[PDB]
Write a protein of this length. Structure first.
Length: 340
């Protein structure tokens, strides 16, 4: 019987290392709160590189640092890659229907006392992480200030988190993008094969030819693609341009990088394609998080910088000299975007 590693964190500060993601979510992680000594699982997400969170509490949703008492726990793993995690610990994290818990030779339910995390589809249609109180057999989740609950038979089919104690399967093709979680100035993940703008060195702002790698941040609730790259010490620098601002310092905290650890098992390919062509149809479409796609901006003199294209505004931005290098109108049509 194996054990999960839970880590206390201050709401409003960066995530601990290797936070456990919710299946199918770009920006959602498994969390745990105690209220009057009772465990309640809920969810955490990145805003401004910091932990924010939500838990259901007797008819309402609680998200406030004060309301919550300021401290929550995040589920962490020894390694983010399932095969690496299994090798190191004897288990990996898998989401399966609650009913599958009878298969105890294969799966161990993630629980704290009588609480277990559960993915709920809300009345509004969104998948959100809440909890099953296994004492009462009621599932609950908070959204928009309110709790929603389900009891009875239906809870048996809902996805919950298990430790899987056999090797992750092989002989399949990957269709999902692999996103690595990390923080500002963590060691650069070169061995994971991060995706470089244009698949080549760019003519960069510092006067050198250098690779610039696809990164994702969240600021004031909005996803922003930017860039990441190693400094001379092989630590990870990053730079995001959005809403008139450049963010390139330690305020970045937690962020994500697009990686391809095993290039040989992908069921798709990435291609950098001019935006006007990328939107014109066919198999290759922009990779997107919300309205945004990774975008290589290029100046009249050939200088290049990896940033974000918001497709709703058709405005491209990237960090430069304290502002966001904003470009709109037909000029964006000629900028390369990441497609697959």
């Amino acid at each position: 019987e194996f054990e999960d590693t839970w880590a206390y964190n201050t709401i409003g500060s960066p995530f601990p290392d290797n936070p456990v993601r919710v299946k199918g979510q770009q920006n959602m992680y498994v969390a745990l709160w105690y209220k009057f000594g009772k465990p309640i699982h809920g969810r955490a997400w990145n805003d401004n590189g910091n932990v924010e969170c939500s838990f259901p509490y007797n008819k309402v949703e609680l998200t406030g640092a004060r309301d919550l008492g300021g401290q929550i726990q995040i589920l962490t793993a020894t390694e983010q890659d399932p095969t690496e995690q299994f090798k190191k610990t004897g288990f990996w994290y898998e989401w399966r229907p609650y009913k599958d818990r009878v298969n105890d030779q294969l799966l161990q339910l993630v629980r704290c006392g009588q609480s277990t995390p559960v993915i709920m589809k809300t009345k509004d249609g969104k998948d959100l992480l809440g909890y099953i109180d296994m004492s009462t057999e009621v599932a609950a989740v908070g959204v928009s200030g309110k709790s929603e609950q389900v009891a009875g038979g239906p809870i048996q089919d809902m996805l919950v988190l298990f430790r899987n104690v056999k090797a992750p399967p092989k002989g399949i093709k990957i269709y999902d993008d692999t996103w690595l979680d990390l923080k500002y100035r963590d060691p650069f993940p070169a061995a994971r094969n991060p995706i470089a703008a244009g698949g080549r060195k760019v003519k960069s702002d510092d006067g050198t030819e250098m690779f610039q790698y696809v990164a994702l941040w969240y600021e004031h609730g909005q996803p922003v693609f930017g860039r990441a790259y190693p400094d001379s010490a092989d630590k990870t620098l990053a730079n995001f341009g959005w809403g008139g601002q450049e963010n390139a310092g330690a305020e970045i905290g937690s962020f994500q990088m697009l990686v391809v650890p095993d290039p040989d098992i992908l069921g798709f390919e990435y291609k950098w394609i001019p935006y006007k062509e990328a939107k014109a149809g066919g198999p290759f479409k922009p990779l997107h998080v919300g309205e945004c796609t990774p975008c290589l901006l290029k100046d009249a003199n050939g200088t290049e910088r990896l940033g974000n294209l918001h497709m709703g505004m058709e405005k491209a931005t990237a960090g430069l000299a304290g502002k966001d290098s904003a470009v709109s109108g037909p000029a964006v049509g000629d900028f390369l975007v990441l497609c697959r």
